[PDB]
């Protein structure tokens, strides 16, 4: 599968997502951004079935933006993830389920704390310090189980991810073409344009 990683440090949540989009024998694109901003402080990454993936991300984005406008308020990260979980949980028992896994990284301005939610296509949600979807988790959970620390700074988090991406670029069979990294904190969502060699 594609690489979808997330790590929650002291005051931010960082999401790293592979850039490759491959079909059969060809890597069609190497600059794919597997993410959608749901609200100024909530970001969602996704991996899964070819078309379902974006259709789901955009459908969720549309709903959150609608709520924001209607209520002139921003739902908390926990609120948004519960909404996403329910959508997936409905889907799994529908005619053709959405085959999409997501990571929701958000900064809760009311609690002043970053939050990372991992949710699979079945609607299985869990809140974690770090998470991953696909085969990635098989090399990153133990890596992070070892190197991760609660009080880490955003900069330490990025170095921690770099350690993850290097492990993946070493042992994973596929060429996922690097990752796009985004930070979610009290000031919003920004993209680290320099990870191709940080």
């Amino acid at each position: 599968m594609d690489i979808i990683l997330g790590i929650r440090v002291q005051d931010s949540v960082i999401l790293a997502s592979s850039k490759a989009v491959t079909r059969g024998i060809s890597v069609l694109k190497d600059s794919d951004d597997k993410t959608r901003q749901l609200s100024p402080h909530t970001l969602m990454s996704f991996a899964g079935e070819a078309g379902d993936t974006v259709q789901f991300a955009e459908y969720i984005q549309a709903n959150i933006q609608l709520y924001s406008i209607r209520e002139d308020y921003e739902l908390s990260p926990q609120a948004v993830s519960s909404f996403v979980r329910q959508e997936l949980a409905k889907s799994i028992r529908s005619r053709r389920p959405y085959q999409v896994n997501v990571l929701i990284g958000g900064y809760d301005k009311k609690k002043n704390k970053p939050e990372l939610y991992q949710i699979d296509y079945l609607g299985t949600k869990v809140e974690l310090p770090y998470g991953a979807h696909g085969y990635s988790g098989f090399y990153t959970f133990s890596l992070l189980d070892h190197h991760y620390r609660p009080d880490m700074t955003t900069e330490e988090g990025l170095d921690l991810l770099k350690l993850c991406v290097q492990e993946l670029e070493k042992r994973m069979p596929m060429d996922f073409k690097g990752v796009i990294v985004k930070i979610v904190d009290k000031d919003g969502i920004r993209q680290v344009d320099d990870f191709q060699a940080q």
């Binding site: 949980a89 699979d120 079945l122 609607g123 299985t124 869990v126 959970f141």
Partner: protein, 204 residues
């Protein structure tokens, strides 16, 4: 494939002297991959406790469903639902999905606020109620749990004693199951108070 073996997990309930205990492990994995060591499977509505094993998404969904129903029930009845009544509510809610069931193994534990009598019950995924007086087990290590309970259990244990018995039953059963363990939490319930303890256990 088997919805009941994807995430893993166990729950066990026991009756004692004017008390009941309900325990569960904390694991949540995806086949061989352990994913979360903080996934609790016990919930409560008023003084009624519900543990749920099986497919995690359904565990979560069912808890939100019963919180929702017990909330309306309280607003209408003007009293908190009792263990016996809740057991019936769980049963009918499960059977209502007879041909598209929730893949879970529910367990109810509590003390009837009016009779003070301890109560526990189990259910299969479609609602069949198992009402034992001693213990109820559920999950991927249920065989092991049945073994430990049948051996370790004895009637009218005092809270402090029932705690040792329930904990040893859970702990040793979980250690013979690849998909259970990774932490555990035990609830000791009494008419007046409820104590919650996290156990120390193997992390492999």
């Amino acid at each position: 494939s088997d919805p009941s073996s994807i995430n893993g997990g166990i729950v066990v309930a026991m009756t004692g002297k004017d008390c009941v205990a309900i325990a569960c492990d904390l694991r949540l994995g995806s086949q061989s991959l352990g994913v979360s060591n903080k996934f609790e499977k016990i919930f409560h509505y008023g003084h009624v406790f519900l543990g749920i094993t099986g497919l995690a998404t359904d565990v979560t969904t069912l808890n939100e469903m019963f919180r929702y129903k017990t909330n309306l029930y309280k607003l209408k009845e003007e009293r908190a639902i009792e263990p016996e009544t809740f057991t019936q509510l769980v049963s009918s809610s499960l059977y209502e999905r007879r041909f598209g069931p929730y893949f879970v193994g529910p367990v109810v534990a509590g003390i009837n606020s009016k009779s003070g009598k301890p109560f526990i019950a189990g259910f299969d995924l479609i609602g069949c109620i198992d009402e034992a007086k001693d213990f109820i087990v559920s999950g991927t290590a249920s065989d092991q749990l049945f073994g430990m309970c049948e051996s370790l259990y004895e009637p009218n244990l005092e809270p402090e004693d029932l705690f040792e018995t329930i904990s040893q039953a859970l702990l040793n059963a979980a250690d013979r199951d690849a998909l259970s363990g990774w932490g555990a939490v035990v609830y000791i319930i009494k008419k007046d108070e409820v104590v919650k303890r996290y156990l120390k256990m193997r992390q492999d």
